[PDB]
Each structure stands twice: as structure tokens, then as C-alpha cells.
Symmetry: C3
């Protein structure tokens, strides 16, 4: 059954290469910063240093808790300190009982 | 025109194969439980069976109403190939008048 | 660091829509950034399933995500109505509840 959730978080960030995204995903799950991470290839168009840049990137979605969110975000940045990556956080408003428990238990 | 919305829902889950995702998408729409379903190939990383898994999967996003959400999650749980399905629901805070109307009308 | 710091945000918006082809998505993304209506637009290929004319349709499409502010959202949407290839576009808006300080600043500055 669905249950209201206010403690789960989805952190959305991007990295340039598939290799980095795979490495970051595995390491974040190993460190207990995220329970699950998805990687999706994307094209991004954005304003950069005055110009319009178009680039192939990897969109990452980290499934975590509010308790781990700050630490996860800091940690990701430490992995590419030269970068200014996307960093957006969503709050799911429901989940299943079982999926929320799994996610919490994972961390 | 943009309108504020409180009644629309996106339910996210994943399945293993494109075939599975297609069949599940079509059955949800035929059941009147979602107006539209998108499928996107992803790679997933999570801890399972004492190991770190990396699997190719299909991300699904079901577009529905709050009225249909419970019935959709129930039906998913019965039909879903995974022993623990992903289940995350987001609430859009705005849509267009036309698009909201289309979504709700599709689930009459 | 502003790169290392989350902050609570109520002013950012993600507008989600779809278009038929990669070419249309690339043109629309570029035009949107040039207009200053979005700071960043991402494009992802998807398949969509929905009922059309009474029957189930499956279509390949491009999912677009436009990163913008609440101040530009109304104009972005109005602009998309005029420029969008479909006569009834997908339009779903989400509100991120946090961001990094650096990303929020980059975003708001891009649309200033």
C-alpha cells in the first residue's frame, strides 16, 4: 500500500562520462550515501561563459534519505571539485511501505 | 495557460526489459489506471544479495491522477515482475489547462 | 563552499514536455536558452504509451526538461505554446526543494 513520505529524497546531478557515472554510483552505494542510483544518457544545452554549450552528459538520480542528503551532496562534489554540476533535489510525496523500508534499511 | 495543480501524480518504477515495460505500460493504459506512460532505458546500481549490482533496466513514469493512484499501485504490485518494485510518487505543481484536462479526461 | 552546500529552494522550476524528434528538441532547447527562458535544457529519448483515437499508441519521443525560475515559468510556457510542434504539448512542472548554492546562483544569474 502507498504511504505518505516526507523523508525520502531524489538528488539529480550530471557528470560528463558514463565511466564516471558508473564509478560514482557504485561508490555512493558502497559508502551508504544512497540506496540506489540510476544513470540515463542525456543531451544538455546551457548558458556557459557567455555562450550556448551543447553536450552529451549522464543524468544521475540518487535515491536517499534527508538524513544522508547533505553528506551525499558534499561527497559527490569532492569527486569532481573543478565542476559546477547540476544539483536539484526532489521530494517524493508517496512510496510503498516496502520500498521506503528498503531504502531506509540500506542506509 | 499555466494552471496550478494538486491532483496529478507521477508514479515511478523500474522493470528489467523493454518488453516488460511495453507490456506493463499498455496494460495500465488499457485498465484506465494511467493516461500516459513513458519508458527510458537506464543503468541502476544498488546493493543486493550482499553485493553491489549494476543492471540495465527500464525506468517507467506513469502519468495519473490522485483518484487512480491507489488502484495503479495495487495493480502494479500484482503485475510487477520484481520481488521489490520501486515505487516513488511525485506531485507536479503546475500543468497547462489543456494538458491537465486531457490527463483527467483520459481516466474518465 | 557554495559547491559543497545544499540550500532550501522554493523559486526553481523543472518544466517537462515532449517533442517528436531529436532535431526539434535540439532547436527548441537552443531557442529557449537564447530567449533567457531557461538556464539549461536536457533531452532524453523515450517511448510513450497512451490511448489515441480509441486505441493504444506507442511512439518514440524526446523528453525535455527545462530548468528555470518561477519568475520565467509563465513566459516559458507561453513561448512553448507558440513554438511547440505538437498541438497539445505535455506540460508538467515540478519544484525542486533544494539545490547547491552554486547551481542556484548560476541558474538565477543566467536568467537575470
Amino acid at each position: 500500500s502507498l504511504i505518505e513520505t516526507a523523508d525520502l529524497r531524489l538528488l539529480l546531478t550530471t557528470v560528463s562520462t558514463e565511466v564516471e557515472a558508473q564509478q560514482l554510483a557504485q561508490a555512493a552505494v558502497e559508502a551508504g550515501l544512497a540506496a540506489c542510483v540510476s544513470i540515463t544518457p542525456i543531451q544538455s544545452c546551457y548558458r556557459w561563459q557567455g555562450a550556448i554549450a551543447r553536450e552529451t552528459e549522464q543524468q544521475m538520480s540518487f535515491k536517499t534519505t534527508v538524513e544522508q542528503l547533505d553528506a551525499l551532496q558534499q561527497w559527490l562534489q569532492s569527486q569532481h571539485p573543478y565542476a559546477l554540476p547540476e544539483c536539484l533535489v526532489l521530494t517524493p510525496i508517496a512510496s510503498s511501505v516496502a520500498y521506503r523500508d528498503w531504502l531506509r534499511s540500506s542506509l
